[PDB]
Amino acid sequence: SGTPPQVYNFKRLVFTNCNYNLTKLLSLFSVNDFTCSQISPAAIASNCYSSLILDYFSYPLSMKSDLSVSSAGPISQFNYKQSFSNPTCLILATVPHNLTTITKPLKYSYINKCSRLLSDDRTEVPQLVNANQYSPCVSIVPSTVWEDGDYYRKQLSPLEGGGWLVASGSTVAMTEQLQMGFGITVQYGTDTNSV
Amino acid sequence: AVNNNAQALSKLASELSNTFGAISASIGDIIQRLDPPEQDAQIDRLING
Amino acid sequence: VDVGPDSVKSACIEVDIQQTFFDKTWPRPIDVSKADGIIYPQGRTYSNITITYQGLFPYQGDHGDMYVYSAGHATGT
Amino acid sequence: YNITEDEILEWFGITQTAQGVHLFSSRYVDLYGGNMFQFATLPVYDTIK
Amino acid sequence: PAFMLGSSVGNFSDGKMGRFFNHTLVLLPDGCGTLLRAFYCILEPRSGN
Ligand SMILES: *[C@@H]1O[C@H](CO)[C@@H](O[C@@H]2O[C@H](CO)[C@@H](O[C@@H]3O[C@H](CO[C@H]4O[C@H](CO)[C@@H](O)[C@H](O)[C@@H]4O)[C@@H](O)[C@H](O[C@H]4O[C@H](CO)[C@@H](O)[C@H](O)[C@@H]4O)[C@@H]3O)[C@H](O)[C@H]2NC(C)=O)[C@H](O)[C@H]1NC(C)=O
Ligand SMILES: *[C@@H]1O[C@H](CO)[C@@H](O[C@@H]2O[C@H](CO)[C@@H](O)[C@H](O)[C@H]2NC(C)=O)[C@H](O)[C@H]1NC(C)=O
Ligand SMILES: *[C@@H]1O[C@H](CO)[C@@H](O)[C@H](O)[C@H]1NC(C)=O
Ligand SMILES: *[C@@H]1O[C@H](CO)[C@@H](O)[C@H](O)[C@H]1NC(C)=O
Numbered sequence: 246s247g248t249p250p251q252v253y254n255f256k257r258l259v260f261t262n263c264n265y266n267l268t269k270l271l272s273l274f275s276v277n278d279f280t281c282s283q284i285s286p287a288a289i290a291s292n293c294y295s296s297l298i299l300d301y302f303s304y305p306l307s308m309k310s311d312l313s314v315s316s317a318g319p320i321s322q323f324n325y326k327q328s329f330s331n332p333t334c335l336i337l338a339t340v341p342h343n344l345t346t347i348t349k350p351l352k353y354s355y356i357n358k359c360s361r362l363l364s365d366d367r368t369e370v371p372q373l374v375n376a377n378q379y380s381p382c383v384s385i386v387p388s389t390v391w392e393d394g395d396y397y398r399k400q401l402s403p404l405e406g407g408g409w410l411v412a413s414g415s416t417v418a419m420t421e422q423l424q425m426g427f428g429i430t431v432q433y434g435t436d437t438n439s440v
Numbered sequence: 441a442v443n444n445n446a447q448a449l450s451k452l453a454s455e456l457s458n459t460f461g462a463i464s465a466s467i468g469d470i471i472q473r474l475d476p477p478e479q480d481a482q483i484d485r486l487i488n489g
Numbered sequence: 490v491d492v493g494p495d496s497v498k499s500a501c502i503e504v505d506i507q508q509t510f511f512d513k514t515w516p517r518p519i520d521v522s523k524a525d526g527i528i529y530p531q532g533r534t535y536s537n538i539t540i541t542y543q544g545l546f547p548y549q550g551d552h553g554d555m556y557v558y559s560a561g562h563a564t565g566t
Numbered sequence: 567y568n569i570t571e572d573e574i575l576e577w578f579g580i581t582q583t584a585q586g587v588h589l590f591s592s593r594y595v596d597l598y599g600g601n602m603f604q605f606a607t608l609p610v611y612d613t614i615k
Numbered sequence: 616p617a618f619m620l621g622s623s624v625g626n627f628s629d630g631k632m633g634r635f636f637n638h639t640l641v642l643l644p645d646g647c648g649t650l651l652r653a654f655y656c657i658l659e660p661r662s663g664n
Contacts, residue, residue, distance in 0.1 A: 259586060259609055283463055285475045292472060295532070298585065328584065332463070332473070377584035379612045384623060384637060404632070405624050434532045435585055436604070491654065499663020526577050528590065528602045545581065556616070567651040569644075580618070580642075587640075610655070614640065615622040 248348045249303040249425045251390075253324040253356050253383060260297040262439045266290070275339040277306060277424065282314060284332035289429060294440050296432040298377075300325075304426030305353045306337060307417055312426075319415075323359035327428065328376040334429040339422050353417040353424075354390035356382060361401070363408035377430075382412040390414035460489030511557065518550040567606070569593055575600055586610050618642040627660075634660075 250256055267290045279286070302325070311318035312335050314327055327333050340347055359382035360371040374380040385399045393415045401408050459465050462482045464473070470482050519526055528544055570593075577600050579590040589606035592599070620640040627634045635658070643652045 257609070257611070259607075261607070283478075284473055288473045296585065381622075383612070402624050402626070432585065436532055436607070491656070499661050501661065501663055503664075525575075525600065526579075528579065531604070558616075567653075569649055569651060571648060606653075608653070608655075610640075611638075612622055614620045 246346065248350050249301060249423070251324075251350075251354055251388065252302045252304050252320055252426070253380070253386065254388060255300040255302045255325055255428075257298055257300045257377075260299070260440060261295075261436060265297065265440060273341060273344065274336070275341050276336060277339055278309060278312075278335070278337035280312065281334040282327075282332065284334060284431070289334055289431070293438065294431045295434055295436050295438045297440060298430045298432070300377075300428045300430075302426055303350060303353060303423070304337060305417055305420060305424045307353075308355075309337065312337070319357045320355050323356045323374055323380050323382060323412075325428070326374055326376045326378065328430060330376075331430050331432065336427040336429070337424065338427070339424050342422070347423070349419065349423040351389055352419060354414055356380075356386060357394075357413050357415045359412045361406075361408060361410050363406075364403075365408075381410060385410060386412055386414060390416050392416055458489060460485050462486055511559075514555055516552065518552055519547060521549050572597065574598065577602070582610060582614055587614075617644060628662075 281289070308318065308320055310316070311320045313321070314329075314333075340349075358371075359374075359380050360369055361381075362369045372380060382397075385397050387397075395414045395416075396411070397414070398409060398411045401410055457465055462470065462485050464470055467483065467486065470479050470486075474482065521527070527546065530542065572593075574597060577592045579588075579602050581588050581590070585607070587606075587608035587610040588604055589608065590602035591605050592601060592603070594605045595601075595603040618640075619635075619642070621635040621637070623636040624632075625634040625636055626632060637657075638655055639658050640655050641653070641658075644650070645652050
C-alpha cells in the first residue's frame with residue numbers, strides 16, 4: 246500500500262509472534278534480482294527465527310552493482326547500510342502490470358554526499374552512517390529531490406557540536422515501471438523464538 | 441590430580457560450543473541455513489578448529 | 490495519525506524558579522553486590538550458575554543525577 | 567499500559583537497539599525482588615541522541 | 616517520572632534550552648501513577664502567557 250519511500254528513507258517493519266510465508270507474498274512480486282549473504286535462499290521461507298526486520302524503499306536497477314556489502318557508492322555511503330552481525334537478503338523487484346494498488350513517486354533519488362563542517366568554516370568531516378541507522382542528513386533532506394545536485398544546508402547548535410550540516414542529492418528518472426528494493430534481516434535469539 | 445583430570449576432560453566437554461569464526465556452532469544449523477558452496481567453507485573451519 | 494482533542498485556551502500556568510530548595514542530596518549509589526538495577530539476560534534465563542556476561546551496565550557506586558518533583562504553592566485550599 | 571500501585575522499589579530501564587526501543591521493568595515479573603524484563607518493544611525509526 | 620527524547624536540539628522563543636524539533640518521544644506516567652502514556656509524535660508550541 247502507498248508510495249514506496251526513497252532509499253535514504255527506508256521504512257522498517259518488524260515481525261514477532263506471528264507467522265510468515267513468502268509463497269503467499271513473493272508470487273505477486275516481479276523479482277528482478279535475488280541475492281542473499283550469509284544465508285541460503287531456502288532458509289528465509291523454511292527456517293524459524295525469533296524476529297524479522299524488513300526494510301523497503303524505492304530502488305531502480307541502474308545502481309544495481311551498489312547492492313554489495315563492501316561497495317562504497319553514495320547509496321552505500323550516506324543512504325543505506327547493512328548489518329555485519331546478522332545474515333541479510335536483498336530483493337530488487339518491479340510493480341506487476343496487473344497491480345495498481347501501489348503508487349509511483351516522482352523520481353528516484355539518493356544522496357551523493359553528506360558531510361558536516363564546523364563553525365570555524367575551515368574543518369570538514371564526513372559522517373559515516375551506521376548499520377540500520379539514519380544519517381542526520383535525513384533530518385534536513387526532504388522526502389523528494391527536485392533535480393540532480395540539489396543542495397541543502399542547516400545551522401547546527403553549539404550544544405550539538407556547532408557548525409553547519411550540508412548535503413547534496415542526485416536524481417534518476419522513472420523507467421516504464423516502478424522498481425523498488427527490500428532488505429531482509431533475521432534475528433535468532435533477540436526475543437522469544439516464536440516466528 | 442583429580443581436578444587436573446576433571447579439567448582435562450572439561451577441555452573436551454566445553455570446547456564444542458566454539459565456532460572458530462563460523463556463523464554458528466551447530467553443524468545441522470549450518471547445513472540448514474546455508475547453501476553448499478559456503479557451508480563447505482564453514483564446516484571446513486569447524487573441522488580445522 | 491492518532492486521536493486526541495485540543496485543550497483550553499492559551500493560559501499556560503506560571504512556571505517558577507526555585508532551584509535553591511531543590512539542591513539537596515540523598516546519597517544512594519548502586520551496589521552491584523546488593524544487585525540493584527541490572528539488565529537481565531535478554532532471551533535465555535539461567536539457573537544456579539556463575540556466568541561472565543557482556544552487556545550494558547552502570548559503573549559501581551555512581552552517585553547519580555539528582556532529580557525530584559514537589560507540589561506547588563497553596564494558601565489554604 | 568496498566569500499572570497498579572505499591573511501595574516497593576521499582577526499577578525501570580530504557581534502551582535502543584537496531585531492532586527498536588526496549589522498555590524493561592520489574593512491575594511485570596519480580597515485584598518483591600526487582601530486575602529488568604522486557605515489557606515493551608517499540609518500533610522506533612531513528613536513533614535517539 | 617516523565618521522559619522526553621529526540622535527536623534535534625534548538626532553543627525556544629526566549630532562547631532557553633529545551634526546544635526540540637521534528638518527531639519526539641514523550642513518556643508520561645499518569646492517572647496517579649497508573650498509565651504509562653507513550654507516543655512518538657509531533658510537538659507544536661503555543662504562544663500565550
Ligand atoms: C513497607 O514495609 C515493608 C518493608 O518495611 C515492605 O513491604 C513488605 O516487604 C517484604 C520484603 O521482605 C515483602 O516480603 C516478600 O514476600 C514475598 C511473598 O509475598 C507474597 O506471598 C504472600 C503469601 O506468602 C502474600 O501474602 C503476599 O501478598 C505476596 O503475594 C516473598 O516472595 C519475598 O521474598 C523475597 O525476598 C526473600 C529474602 O527476603 C528471598 O528469599 C525470596 O526469594 C524473594 O526474593 C519477600 O519475603 C512483603 O510482601 C512486603 N509487603 C507487602 C504488603 O507487599 C514495603 O517497603 C512496605 N510495605 C507495604 C507498603 O505494604
Ligand atoms: C547450586 O550450586 C551450589 C554450588 O555448586 C550447590 O551447593 C552445593 O550443593 C552440593 C549438593 O547439593 C553440596 O554437596 C555442596 O556442599 C554445596 N556447596 C556448598 C559450597 O555448600 C547447590 O546445591 C546448587 N543448588 C541446586 C538447587 O542445584
Ligand atoms: C525538522 O524541523 C526543522 C524546523 O524548521 C525543519 O527545517 C526540518 O526540515 C525538519 N526535518 C524533518 C525531517 O522533518
Ligand atoms: C486497563 O484496565 C482498564 C479497566 O477497565 C481496561 O479498560 C483497559 O483496557 C486496561 N488496559 C490494559 C493495557 O490492560
